[PDB]
Write a protein that binds this ligand. Structure first.
Ligand SMILES: N[C@@H](CC(=O)O)C(=O)O
Ligand SMILES: N[C@@H](CC(=O)O)C(=O)O
Ligand SMILES: N[C@@H](CC(=O)O)C(=O)O
Ligand SMILES: N[C@@H](CC(=O)O)C(=O)O
Lengths: 326, 326, 326, 326
């Protein structure tokens, strides 16, 4: 049977809450061995090893956990046939993309979480973790980058995003769609990501103890320049704009960032809008102000790639090329 | 024929850009008479009156325009059989909700914009404005609150949100769905909003020259408390959290706002997640910290209702009741 | 606590496999009392009683079970505070709509099923049933017609359809959306159906032992007229076209359905297309030929209405009327 | 500039009404040269030439046009840099897939249609055709099989289907998603189909004047076995079940299709359900009875594959093989 490492970093997948019929619970309170023995059917398909990395709620997720994650995956590559990370759903789309860029293992890394806590009636997490292990054990799952397996679906880490607050089917690759579906412990893969991933990137976090500070401002009607101004005062290496429509800013947030761009801050335009590209050659001359268009990458996902781009260069056009490649 | 007032505040619906096959253009550069005479078929269904309110891009939209808007609609109620506001698509979901709460006209107010500029090949705006006028002229459209009519669909202002950056079909009511569809200049309405709207609210902007400052922070991995802290320094009456999953915050953004709640700032939890409620009785004890759960209202939409709630009260539980009613 | 009767018909909610990990199962081999006792949390929210009506896979559902279900609900109406129907998912949309039109009872009738068998890991049916009892218990569910509760979502019988073959979230209201969502045993209803339903209809099945024969024919490239033909020859009372696009016919089906319609068969043009209305005033002169446009009714839903419409009149214009009203 | 041939078949792209405001029209009454000349921006991006193949409404599309189209494309393959097929929207999914399997040509074949007639206000077809010439001109479109370009979106012939009766955005890839999006004449391709296509298939239509007869039968509550029966009796070569749920049959259709399948008719179980696979290993012993599971192929797509599969073998296991591969 395939040697699958489970890496455990928390999430509702490992959270409980008194009544099976109450929505009240705590993230990251259950250990990796409980999870594993809660799904005895893993024994039949994998030689699972549990390792607890942290035990937090992914709302609390951070760079440290990311760096600890890439490292341990990269370091433990050749002692196992695939990895599975149990993770909170709230920021799984970020970690998954982070790992997607920083992991150099060709072998299946798969993230998985659960929208209902383990004490819930009809809890999602057992079958989630089952199918995630299945995915991790499929030969075909190799060389497709970091995966999220949720609700019977294999999603790529680049596009996977959380579309609903509570639905078990919340995870969806909302622009290019999923890679394959899971029936009966078998996957028919029909799609594979075309953007460069895992081993095909230059990113290398091996020797890194922290990441270039990057923050996110939201644009709305009458948007305040105060969030933006704050981040530059504090010397942020990067601001990602959560812009309106095709990545537009408010007048004040525009000027602040237009300045910031001329004074060394990288600025990437993305969109609060849930699907679709932030394009160049629309209403904002990106070359003129030195901005970068985030493409299909929503804000938080743009934040991930900004940080890792920043650890190569500070130049608007080198970054844009990285948004067009990765 | 029905006396329909068009109110013009800008948008791509009134923007152009050299080549019909280039995506480069300027918002708010075309006047209301050009728009009207660009769609001669309005003459057959309405007695249209054009009035230019401003001529901006809705990325630049603000409170002044909102207040000018409600007022003129409320004031001109009884000189016309319905209104239509031409608006940029970027923040139409906000204005539409604003108007939804502040307008006291039972008569059809309908917003409309276009995702392709008027010089574009196969431009959306003609037919958009046609069908919006149709909507404004339908008796059935009365008493359903402020409407967005886009891509052959009548959407309520509360739920209407912009789901795509570029698609002409971007506007969708992503939790409770549309109210009716438009075929052949006729609408079959099947749905009407159940939340209190227009005349059934207490909001009254008649005598108001400004609105309680409210801002939006975004939560992500390793979120900075700097945006939040900034807004409280400056004495904001309200912060809306763009939280992860079911409205969760990062540890730092949590504490800052937990403080802010104890020191007079209203704090409303919403979600960056595009569909679904921010619920109470989930992972965050709202009563304990004095927070308010934004419900199906995304951040920007929560911002609208926070501002207008703030002009009644500063108390967490009176506000929550307004999020549950409106 | 309310009194809630469960009319169990079968399906996968009541199906079984030899495995929680394999997908191979048999529908409706489990009694009603088993379903009730595997969800003892029902006790906190209602006084439940389960009666077995049939125990079939809903792929085999037929006119007799519907006549049984309906009158049984109308008859036993004031012995209970609410009804929950366990039912297979395959034809549930069809039953829901049928009870939607035939149920003269003024109490919540809620349909529920499962996509995973009860033996299956993370089986959806314990919590489905719970949520369906909640919906059927909530006083606010009255006056919304026959209802379907799947994946934390309350759906109207008219729009509800199965959008996916395997996914737990298959059931959606693809045109007008859901009536309400369910969190922590509570429903935030924001919507009600506008087409008249339940007691508002003239359809009285209480003396019928038998429904007009209505069959359905698929259109597609190079369509055979053999099925149309074979239904006319058995003197079916009505035929529904699952047409292409907006109710369009393949030329030999058009000939057969047109002749048949002059000779007294009713024929409805519906569409194989999964969302959107089959409208009038496109490419087919419905009035010329005696055809009825289905509207948003898909073929099998439109068969439900058409059957019930044939019990009132055999007149094309009058069936249009019903098709515009119910 | 590339050389792009346009094989025009008709549809609404080439349809006309008496009005830009009314919805009443006739499909395919406009010549190819008209289409080309109403979009003179084609000049900047290609050397276009339009040949008229037929001028039908695609609701009337049939096996002969497909045989014509296919060989004409294979024959005229190296006279051009690319092909664009104008075509009605109703059966376009069916043609696309057919050319997907039959086109041995190694150049972009792109299908395009319109949902609004050319006379209509904000008609979608000028820009559709433009975008289809872009797609057919882009060198990056090679090696992705026969393609469909609608609403700024490049879709693979296999997954693409018409999800809505009237909306300009009807065409989606409902299972695996789009191949690429189109902005400002440019395509960000992030995906390619994995099922083998075009030259990768053993289907050679180049000497066929005639395709195996394959019909389609709908399942629904109380289904008539009359259509199945009537197709067996005309010695159809194959039958597709538009089943309920995951390929399920109504009992009398099951009997008829099972007997027919032992007697040499091939029968595929597809599904009326608009998304998701008709899988094996659920409720039907496909192997026992000689049935083939369609997978993600919907009935009409599955008829395309089944027809072409009948030209290779009459053997159930071997048609499964094709159904797992193409
Ligand atoms: N707050 C949780 C949500 C979940 O896991 O369901 C998290 O850690 O993301
Ligand atoms: N930036 C534009 C976008 C549009 O109208 O299409 C606006 O004013 O919202
Ligand atoms: N064949 C089953 C499917 C299910 O219930 O999940 C039925 O319709 O009974
Ligand atoms: N009946 C038309 C529909 C369209 O093209 O929009 C066709 O399929 O030809």
């Amino acid at each position: 049977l395939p040697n699958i490492t489970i890496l455990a970093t928390g999430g509702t997948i490992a959270g409980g809450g008194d009544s099976a019929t109450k929505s009240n619970y705590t993230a990251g309170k259950v250990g990796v061995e409980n999870l594993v023995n809660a799904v005895p059917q893993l024994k039949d398909i994998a030689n699972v090893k549990g390792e607890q990395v942290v035990n937090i709620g992914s709302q609390d997720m951070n760079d440290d956990v990311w760096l600890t994650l890439a490292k341990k995956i990269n370091t433990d590559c050749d002692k196992t046939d695939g990895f599975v990370i149990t993770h909170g759903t709230d920021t799984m789309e970020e970690t998954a993309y982070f790992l997607d860029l920083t992991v150099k293992c060709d072998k299946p890394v798969v993230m998985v979480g659960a929208m209902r806590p383990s004490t819930s009636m009809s809890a999602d997490g057992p079958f989630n973790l089952y199918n995630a292990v299945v995915t991790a054990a499929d030969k075909a799952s190799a060389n497709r980058g970091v995966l999220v397996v949720m609700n019977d679906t294999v999603l790529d880490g680049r596009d996977v995003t959380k579309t609903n607050t509570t639905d078990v089917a919340t995870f969806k690759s909302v622009n290019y769609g999923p890679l394959g579906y899971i029936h009966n412990g078998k996957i028919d893969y029909q799609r594979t990501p075309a953007r460069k991933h895992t081993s095909d990137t230059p990113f290398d976090v091996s020797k890194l103890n922290e990441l270039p500070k990057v923050g996110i401002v939201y644009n709305y009607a009458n948007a305040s320049d105060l969030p933006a101004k704050a981040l530059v005062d504090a010397g942020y290496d990067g601001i990602v704009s959560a812009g309106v429509g095709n990545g537009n800013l408010y007048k004040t947030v525009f000027d602040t960032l237009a300045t910031a761009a001329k004074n060394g801050t990288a600025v990437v335009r993305s969109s609060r809008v849930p699907t679709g590209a932030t394009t160049q050659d629309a209403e904002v001359d990106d070359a003129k102000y030195g901005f970068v268009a985030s493409g299909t990458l929503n804000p938080q996902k743009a934040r991930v790639l900004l940080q890792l781009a920043l650890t190569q260069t500070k130049d608007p056009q080198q970054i844009q090329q990285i948004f067009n490649q990765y």
